[PDB]
Amino acid sequence: ANEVNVYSYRQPYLIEPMLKNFEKDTGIKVNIIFADGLVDRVKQEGELSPADVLLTVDISRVMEIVNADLAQKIDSKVLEKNIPAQFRDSNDQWFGLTTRARVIYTSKDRVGKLPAGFDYLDLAKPEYKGKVCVRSGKNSYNVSLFAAMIEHYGIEKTKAFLEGLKANLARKPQGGDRDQVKAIKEGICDYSIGNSYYYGKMLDDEKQKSWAEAAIINFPSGEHGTHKNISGVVIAKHSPNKANAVKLIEYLSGEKAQGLYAELNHEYPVKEGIEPSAIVKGWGTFKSDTIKLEDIAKNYEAALKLVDEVKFDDFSE
């Protein structure tokens, strides 16, 4: 046909606008399934997998796919021009489309703004007992944060951090990132961990704006700064519509789509010269962790093991 088969780890509200604009501008039909491809299914199906494009939200998932030989190399002058080298594979098998920060939200009323020098690590200190909310420790946004911490500190110190963080939780890990900010608004907790773009999404939503208004976005500024991760894309090894798949990822890297990522999603474009939204610009800039993206993913397995050892999500005692 004239189609492309997309498997998306992103829910419709954070990707449909980009894909609909792609369909209108190119004439190529997008078939989309929301993941639950699934890496194990893509592997076992092998040559019969209909997947063209896998849209990811985490570098560690990207490297799981690439390491399993489920991607293929894409050499595109358009991707080269649009995506800075630090946000795509040197070996051409994966491509970053946005960056996002995993930030600390605080209660406007009960905490205020965090001081310069505040670190993720501070959330494990005894004085924050009963005041911290985080979604499941096994959620990959969290595990990739902990993976970066292993690169910086090793597994003993990272485990001690996880034990302290767990000890300080106000409630059993539950919900997603926005839900923790709702909990700040309601008074259940005073500090949460979540991705930056969700603050802008909440502000844009009539039903969630009060959640964001009750919280302050903070970019950690300890030794290794603020954790960054990427939304991205891989073209599957056996892509049945590969030319169309390349046109899709080239489109997502371009000026128009990158502007949509900025203005609609409140994410940081990878493409230089594309301004963030007014909301995102208002937060100011921050010192990013200089860790290489692959060096986050390298530690994912070890981080997941630590989360299991500390039984992070168990709130029984």
Q: How many helices (H) and strands (E) does the chain have?
A: 13, 9
Q: Is there a single domain that holds both residue 218 and residue 239? A: no
- The torsion angles phi and psi of 119, rounded to 5 degrees, stand at -125, 155
Q: Is there a single domain that holds both residue 87 and residue 116? A: no
DSSP of 66-129: HHTT-B-----HHHHHHS-GGGB-TTSS-EEEEEEEEEEEEETTTT-SPPTT--GGGGGSGGGT
Q: Which residues are annotated as a binding site for Fe(3+)?
A: 141, 197-198
Q: Is there a single domain that holds both residue 81 and residue 115? A: no
Place of tokens 């302050």: 216
Q: Is there a single domain that holds both residue 184 and residue 230? A: no
Q: Is there a single domain that holds both residue 158 and residue 74? A: no
Any residues with CB less than 8 A from the CB of 286 and at least 6 apart, and which? 101, 219, 221, 225, 226
Going 188 to 192 to 195 to 201, the CA torsion angle's sign is positive
Tell me if 198 sits within 8 A of 175, measured CB to CB.
no
Place of tokens 């890496």: 39
Q: Which residues are annotated as a binding site for Fe cation?
A: 197-198
Domain that holds residue 7: 1-97+226-274
Tell me if 288 sits within 8 A of 196, measured CB to CB.
no
Q: Is there a single domain that holds both residue 116 and residue 189? A: yes
Q: Which residues are annotated as a binding site?
A: 141, 197-198
- The torsion angles phi and psi of 207, rounded to 5 degrees, stand at -80, -20
Q: Is there a single domain that holds both residue 207 and residue 237? A: no
Q: At 260, which CATH number? A: 3.40.190.10
